Design a protein around this ligand. Sequence first.
Ligand SMILES: CC(=O)N[C@@H]1[C@@H](O)[C@@H](O)[C@@H](CO)O[C@H]1O
Ligand SMILES: CC(=O)N[C@@H]1[C@@H](O)[C@@H](O)[C@@H](CO)O[C@H]1O
Ligand SMILES: CC(=O)N[C@@H]1[C@@H](O)[C@@H](O)[C@@H](CO)O[C@H]1O
Lengths: 143, 142
Amino acid sequence: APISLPAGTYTLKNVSTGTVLDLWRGEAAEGTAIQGYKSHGGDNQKWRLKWTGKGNQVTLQNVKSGTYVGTASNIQNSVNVVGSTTAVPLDIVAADKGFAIEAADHRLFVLDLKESNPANETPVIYYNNNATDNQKWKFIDEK
Amino acid sequence: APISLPAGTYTLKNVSTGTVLDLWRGEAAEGTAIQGYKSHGGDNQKWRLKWTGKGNQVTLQNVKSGTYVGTASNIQNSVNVVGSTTAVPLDIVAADKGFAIEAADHRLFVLDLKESNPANETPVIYYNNNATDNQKWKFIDE
Ligand SMILES: CC(=O)N[C@@H]1[C@@H](O)[C@@H](O)[C@@H](CO)O[C@H]1O
Ligand SMILES: CC(=O)N[C@@H]1[C@@H](O)[C@@H](O)[C@@H](CO)O[C@H]1O
Ligand SMILES: CC(=O)N[C@@H]1[C@@H](O)[C@@H](O)[C@@H](CO)O[C@H]1O
């Protein structure tokens, strides 16, 4: 009424665990692990959603580090999601709960909280989209 | 606040024109036109959103007719979107304004308000996703 997902800063909360998308210590170094972690409201747990101007593609950028949701190597199953100066372009797709986050140039793969594990520092990885709950993210807007 | 697009009944308003997704007289016959039309709040301008259980795919069902966003022939450019007993599976993709509505098994093609034309009874068609504003839809929950 209307429902929109505007460009802005988001807390990203895993549907399965209630844990949030977390950049390891908020560090800017290339390859810094992106993981599930207990929500604490810190900037390393905030992400800027922005459209690139190519189709409906977006990027996600860590507020603390300034680095982007990226990849540890060539995107395929079980590849780590990592903070990177090179953003992996994403598509944000409406799911039965929250949204799926697909790699826009590798659409078979989505951001995946590994094995629905609620423990801190559980890896987020690229994985085949099976539309399981651990592959869905609630977008919580910061106003 | 947690932005969700829940299964529910929706008005879908084209970003470019401001006209809404409209099933011609809410008629249930196969092949009935789906089009842009000025918003009057009637049930033929309301759509049920539901996940099919395959991936993140959904369907859109007209409240008035009970028929679905569908097609009368295989999806390519300028193929018309029509009301049908057989739903075309869809993907709802977040756009810079509103949402794009892709054909789930033909992702290059999205619901498109022809020529960004705000005239009543402008046809909605399947078209090449260019991410133009006539290919984006605002979801108004009721
Ligand atoms: C407030 C803050 O930055 N806490 C982070 C935490 O979120 C997590 O990244 C952890 C490493 O797993 O390091 C901590 O310093
Ligand atoms: C109030 C109402 O239902 N108006 C409908 C309109 O939405 C549209 O479908 C038109 C056919 O183009 O028929 C009208 O009867
Ligand atoms: C015949 C046809 O498909 N018409 C397209 C329309 O779909 C739309 O994308 C528009 C841009 O507003 O360009 C038109 O030429």
